[PDB]
Design a protein around this nucleic acid. Sequence first.
RNA 1: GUAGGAUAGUGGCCUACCAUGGUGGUGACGGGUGACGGAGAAUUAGGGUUCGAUUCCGGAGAGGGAGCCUGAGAAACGGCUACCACAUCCAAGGAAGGCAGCAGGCGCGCAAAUUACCCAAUCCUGACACGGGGAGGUAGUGACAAUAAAUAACAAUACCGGGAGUCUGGUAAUUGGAAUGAGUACAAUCUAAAUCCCUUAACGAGGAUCCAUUGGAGGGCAAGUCUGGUGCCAGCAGCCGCGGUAAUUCCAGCUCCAAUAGCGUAAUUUAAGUUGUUGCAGUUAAAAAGCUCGUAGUUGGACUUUG
Lengths: 61, 141, 261, 184, 48
Amino acid sequence: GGKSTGFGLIYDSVENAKKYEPKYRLIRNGLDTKVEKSRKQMKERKNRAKKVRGVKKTKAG
Amino acid sequence: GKTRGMGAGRKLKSHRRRQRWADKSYKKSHLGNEWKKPFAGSSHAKGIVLEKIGIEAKQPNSAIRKCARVQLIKNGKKIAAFVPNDGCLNYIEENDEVLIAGFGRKGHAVGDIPGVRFKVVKVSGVSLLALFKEKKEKPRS
Amino acid sequence: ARGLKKHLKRLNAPKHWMLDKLGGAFAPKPSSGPHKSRECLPLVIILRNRLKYALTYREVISILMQRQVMVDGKVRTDKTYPAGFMDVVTIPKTNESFRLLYDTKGRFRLHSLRDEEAKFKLCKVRSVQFGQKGIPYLNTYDGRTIRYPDPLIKANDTIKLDLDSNKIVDFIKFDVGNVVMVTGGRNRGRVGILKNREKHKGSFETVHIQDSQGHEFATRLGNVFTLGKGSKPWVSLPKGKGIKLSIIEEARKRMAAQSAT
Amino acid sequence: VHVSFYRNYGKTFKKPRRPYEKERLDAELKLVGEYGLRCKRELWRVQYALSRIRNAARMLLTLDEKDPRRIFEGEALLRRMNRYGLLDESQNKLDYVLALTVENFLERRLQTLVFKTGMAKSIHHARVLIRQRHIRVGRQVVNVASFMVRVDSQKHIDFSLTSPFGGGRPGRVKRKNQKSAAKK
Amino acid sequence: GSLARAGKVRGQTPKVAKQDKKKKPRGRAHKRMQYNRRFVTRGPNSSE
RNA sequence: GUAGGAUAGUGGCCUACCAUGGUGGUGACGGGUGACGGAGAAUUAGGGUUCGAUUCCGGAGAGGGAGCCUGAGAAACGGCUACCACAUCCAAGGAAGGCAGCAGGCGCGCAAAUUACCCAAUCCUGACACGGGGAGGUAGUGACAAUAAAUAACAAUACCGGGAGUCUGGUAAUUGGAAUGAGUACAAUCUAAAUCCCUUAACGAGGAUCCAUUGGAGGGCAAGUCUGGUGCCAGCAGCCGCGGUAAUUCCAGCUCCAAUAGCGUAAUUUAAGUUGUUGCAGUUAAAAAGCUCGUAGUUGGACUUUG
Ligand SMILES: [K+]
Ligand SMILES: [K+]
Ligand SMILES: [K+]
Ligand SMILES: [K+]
Ligand SMILES: [K+]
Ligand SMILES: [K+]
Ligand SMILES: [K+]
Ligand SMILES: [K+]
Ligand SMILES: [Mg+2]
Ligand SMILES: [Mg+2]
Ligand SMILES: [Mg+2]
Ligand SMILES: [Mg+2]
Ligand SMILES: [Mg+2]
Ligand SMILES: [Mg+2]
Ligand SMILES: [Mg+2]
Ligand SMILES: [Mg+2]
Ligand SMILES: [Mg+2]
Ligand SMILES: [Mg+2]
Ligand SMILES: [Mg+2]
Ligand SMILES: [Mg+2]
Ligand SMILES: [Mg+2]
Ligand SMILES: [Mg+2]
Ligand SMILES: [Mg+2]
Ligand SMILES: [Mg+2]
Ligand SMILES: [Mg+2]
Ligand SMILES: [Mg+2]
Ligand SMILES: [Mg+2]
Ligand SMILES: [Mg+2]
Ligand SMILES: [Mg+2]
Ligand SMILES: [Mg+2]
Ligand SMILES: [Mg+2]
Ligand SMILES: [Mg+2]
Ligand SMILES: [Mg+2]
Ligand SMILES: [Mg+2]
Ligand SMILES: [Mg+2]
Ligand SMILES: [Mg+2]
C-alpha cells in the first residue's frame, strides 16, 4: 500500500479523443453509451438470414 | 580381447547390438511379449469378479490367502487378484466391478502367495482402504 | 500447405525485432515489398515498439491511415510495410526523420537525420543487364530498377539515390580500401575497411574487413554494403560507428557509468 | 496454441538420496531449529542454490585463467556474492566461492537479520513479525522470511510505517480492548 | 481353502476409543519443540 | 541410350525402338515397430541410457479409395462427382449427409474440463481506419506439474536442568496482556463487461474446535524388548522373515519416528564396471570353436631437412 501506478492520456480536445480513443474508454468517462448485444445471438441471426434471398432476409425472424 | 582398431567402429557397434539380447531386462522390453500380458502394458485394469477363492500359503508359512478370480473387461482374460488387509474379502461379491493393479514386482509373484501377481484396489468404484477404515461404504443395499 | 502462409507465429519472428514471447501468439507478418521479410522492420514495430507513438495495433492503423508517415519520400499506409536497411522514414508532423541502420549488436536503429541528409539514400546494385529494346538497366537490393545507368556501374557497387529526382547522383565501385558495413550474419552492424577479396569459383566470395581498432573479421560478399569511398562513409553512423566492443569492455563501461551516474 | 504454455518454471530443491541417515537428520534439524525454518524443504532449497553457485565456480576454475569467458563470468559471480554479503572484498577469487557453506546463505535471510539486528527477541519471533507485515526493506514492505537481503539494503531494515511498531495505529486487539475499557 | 474365517481376528478385537488430547503445534512450531527436545534438553520411545 | 508425347519445367514421368543393365555381409530385398521427423525432454562426474502424440519448423490426413471443377495458388473436403462403409429426413415420389475446428454427447477405456463471455490485447482477412475471426483472449472446472508461504509469538508464575548461591535454557487444555491473516465486507481499483489478485472502513483467535495429514516403529531404515486381543487361525511381509497361549513384525490403545499441505500404491533413468568405447568377464564360479586353412573385415617394422 501507500503507492499506485497507472497510465494517463491527455487529449487536446474532446473531439480528438472521440476519434482516437477506443470505445470502451469513452464509456468509462461518460462520453459514449453502451449498446447491449449478444454475440451468439448475432451469429445465429447471420446463419438464419443467409438461407433467404432478397429483401426477405431482414424480415426472417 | 576387445577389438581396438580405429577403423573397427562397425564391429564394436554390431557386437554390442547382438549381446544386449543376452540381458534379461533388455530382452523383456524389446521382445514385444509385454502386450500379451493380461494388462497389456497397463498399470491398472478393471474386471468382473468370477468367484471368491482361497490359496494355500507357500511353505514354511501356513495360511489361506484370500484371493478372487477376475476376468478383465478390456480383453476377457482371467487372473487371480489378492485381496489385502483383514476381513476385506467380505467387501467383495461375485460379478462385481473391481480395479486391479500389480503386486509390486512387475509381473512376478510376491511373498508366500503362489502364482499371484495382482491385487485388488477398488470394489464397486470404492477403494478397499476406505472400506477397511470405514471411511466409505459400498453403493448398494 | 496448399498455398501462401499469411500468419507469423511470435516465436518464429526474427530475433532482432525483440518481441516479448508472452506478448501474444502472433507477430506482424511482413508484407511483400522492397526488402525481405527476415531483413526488414515493419512500420507497426517502428511506430509502436520503437517510437512509442502508438500503444496498440489499432492505433498504428490510425496513424498510417492519416497519411502521416512516409518511407523513401512516399506515403505508406500498410501496417506491415517492410522498411529495411538505408530506408528513410519521415514524419512531417513531428518534424522527425530517421534512417534504418544496424547497431553494433545487429539490430535496426532509428538514427535521427537532419533535414538536408534525409533527401537521399544508399542502394546496393544487384546486377546490370540489357532489358527490352537493348536498353541497359540495373536493379538494386531494395527492389528498385533504374534504366540508363552509368556504364561504369557494375554489380555489388553502391549508388547514391536522390529521393526527389529519383536519379543516381553518385556511385562507389566495390573495391578493397573502401569503408563498408556488414548487413547480415554474425558480424551484422560492424563497420570496417575492406582489406581483401577471396574468390572461389562456383562458391561464395569471402571478404576480409578490418575494424578501425585493428579487429579483423570475415563475411560473405552478399552481406557487405559499401558506405563511402576511402575511409569516410557518405551517411551518418550511430554513436558506436560500427565498433563492436567485447563483453568485458562493455561491462567495464557499465561499471564506470554507475560510479559517475 | 496457448501463450501461457511458453511460461517457464523449474524446481528449487532436491530430496536426499538417503532418507534415514541419522547423522544427516541430526545436522539438518540443528540448522532448522537454529534459524527457525518451517521444514526441511527450506534448508534443501538453500543447499540446491549453493550447489548451483559452486558448480558454476568449478567450471570456471577448470578453464585457463586467461580465457575471456573465465574472466567475464568469474567477475560477475564474485560481484553477485559481494552484493549479498556472502564474500568479502579480500576474497576476490573463485576459490573462495567453493568455500561457501549453507550457514552463509542462511545468515543473509531477512528472518536471521531481523533477529540479529535487535528488532526481534528470538529467531522464531522474527518469523512471525515478517509474515505479519511489520518489517520493510527500505520503502517496500516484505512479508517473506526467505528474502535474501543485500549489503546495500541491510542498513535500511526497519518497521513498516503502517505497523503499530513503526508509527502506525495499534492493532485490533488493543483497539478493541481500549473500546471495552471506554465502555466501562 | 475355507473362506468362512475371513475377518476373524479383527472382529474379535475389543473396541477401544481413542483418547482426545491437545494437538501438537504445526509447521515451524513443531520443529521448534522437536529441536529443544533433542539438542537443548535411551531412545525417543524407550519404555523407561 | 535415341526420337517423341505430357508437364510450369528436369526426369522411364509416359510411348516406340534399342542395349543388358541396376542393388547387395560396407546387410540389398523382405519382415517388425504399441514408428510422423526435427528443434528438443528425463536422467546425467565423464562417456552414456531412455523418451520425443502435443502449442516452434517440416510433412501428412480430413470415415475408406478414386476423380475433378474453380482459381495466382487445392488433386480442397466447414467445394463438387462416383463407388464402398455408416447414417438422417420423407406425405415413401425423393432429398440431405462428414466435429482428427470450439463446446458437448455416446462408446472405448487405468486414463482427460464449460453445449460460458469477448474481439479489449496479439495478429489475420475483405471493397475495407469502421465488418468478421470458437484463430486468439477472458472466466469456469482443474492436488498434471511448478513457486512463495499460515496453523502461533512474547511475558509473568508453577515445575525441571545447566553454567548453598544466582544468572541463562526447557515444559504446562495454568494466568496475562500484544500481533495477525484465513474469513467477511463499505469502497476504490482491476476488466471489453465481470471475477480474482493488489489496496483498504468496519468485523474477525485461547482447548487461538480457525482441531494436519499420509505412511511407519525386528533388520535393510529414522522410530517401543509398552498394554489388551488373537494362537501357524486371522493377517503381515517389496527382500530376509513374523504368527503353533507370555507376538518388539498380525488386530487395537498409547507413545515415538519420517516427510509435511502434502503423502502412499501400481513404464523408464540412476544404482549397473550386472552390456563395460571410456570400462567388465571366459583354468576351476555362466563363458576358447576338436584342429588347421582361408576371402571380406580389422590390424601391420624401420628409413627421406636437421642444426
Ligand atoms: K558398448
Ligand atoms: K506444398
Ligand atoms: K518434364
Ligand atoms: K529416354
Ligand atoms: K483467385
Ligand atoms: K481483436
Ligand atoms: K480490420
Ligand atoms: K573409469
Ligand atoms: Mg592384450
Ligand atoms: Mg494449415
Ligand atoms: Mg552459383
Ligand atoms: Mg526426353
Ligand atoms: Mg517401351
Ligand atoms: Mg520416434
Ligand atoms: Mg503410427
Ligand atoms: Mg513430435
Ligand atoms: Mg499413435
Ligand atoms: Mg491435443
Ligand atoms: Mg504442426
Ligand atoms: Mg489435404
Ligand atoms: Mg471420425
Ligand atoms: Mg478430398
Ligand atoms: Mg468439419
Ligand atoms: Mg479445412
Ligand atoms: Mg487426469
Ligand atoms: Mg487446520
Ligand atoms: Mg489475503
Ligand atoms: Mg503397532
Ligand atoms: Mg533404527
Ligand atoms: Mg501382547
Ligand atoms: Mg517392519
Ligand atoms: Mg544383470
Ligand atoms: Mg560380471
Ligand atoms: Mg562344473
Ligand atoms: Mg564353467
Ligand atoms: Mg610404420
